[PDB]
Symmetry: C2
Subunit: 163 residues, 2 copies
């Protein structure tokens, strides 16, 4: 289990170690190293998802390890409450950013090993604290340069407890 | 010179071959191959920029060649009318997507060879058709899945003439 202690409250998560081995191993290493402590949810889209794991307050970009392979062919779907890895246009580009589905985002699901089908890898799920997730999805946002949907007041993962 | 023949009119551009050699060579190869024909401006932000070169009508993602090295240390600034390469969080991640500055976006300028300073590489400038660029920046947009700021009616680069 992993708990995100945020300035809005705790979010407890169980990881799907057996269904997304490389992804979970990647995630837990960043958690154990304290990589996510003092990072924010920099992209919040009501009715869609909340994304975090890449910047410190003040939009300060953190350096990450090598990207991981997309494991979305594990068949897990992007339903409300699940956590998937954020990635660039390339399928094997995920590093540290992840997002939480606040609704079922079926359009994000894997549909085949192609550039257009690969989708987004679900590796975990919220088992407690969805009401904290729902409080965060509703905060006021704005543009912050290149970045859109940035919360006006920082949503901070203060520390993370692994198990 | 390169002309983008769009469904809103022509946009003529001169490239800075000597100041961004790898970038211009990359750009002109995609132009010559017909890579940009039938692609759209998928991200339009009024008062900021219009971005294109990666999708076909219907948000169909195109495959690209290997990424290029960031040449933003060439000192060129992101002023109104210039074209810079769009990239991911990593500095050496640009492929085919580019954007047009519709205002001076100083915050995008290179400030040192660091993850936080690298900025965005200016490789060209609009010499004719800025009024077409200004017509495009104002079109109605919406969310289209993972993508924000997508034009409701497609803004299409029909064909491209190189010189």
């Amino acid at each position: 289990m992993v708990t995100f202690h945020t300035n809005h409250g705790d979010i407890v998560i169980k990881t799907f170690d057996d269904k997304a081995p490389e992804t979970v191993k990647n995630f837990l290493d960043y958690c154990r190293e304290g990589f996510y402590n003092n990072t924010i949810f920099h992209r919040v889209i009501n009715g869609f998802m909340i994304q975090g794991g890449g910047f410190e307050p003040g939009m300060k970009q953190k350096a990450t390890k090598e990207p991981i392979k997309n494991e979305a062919n594990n068949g897990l779907k992007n339903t409300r409450g699940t956590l998937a890895m954020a990635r660039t246009q390339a399928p094997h580009s995920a590093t540290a950013q992840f997002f939480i589905n606040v609704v079922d985002n079926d359009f994000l699901n894997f549909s085949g090993e192609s550039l257009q089908g690969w989708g987004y890898c679900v590796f975990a799920e919220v088992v407690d604290g969805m009401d904290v997730v729902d409080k965060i999805k509703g905060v006021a946002t704005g543009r912050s340069g290149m970045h859109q949907d940035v919360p006006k007041e920082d949503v901070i993962i203060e520390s993370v407890t692994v198990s």
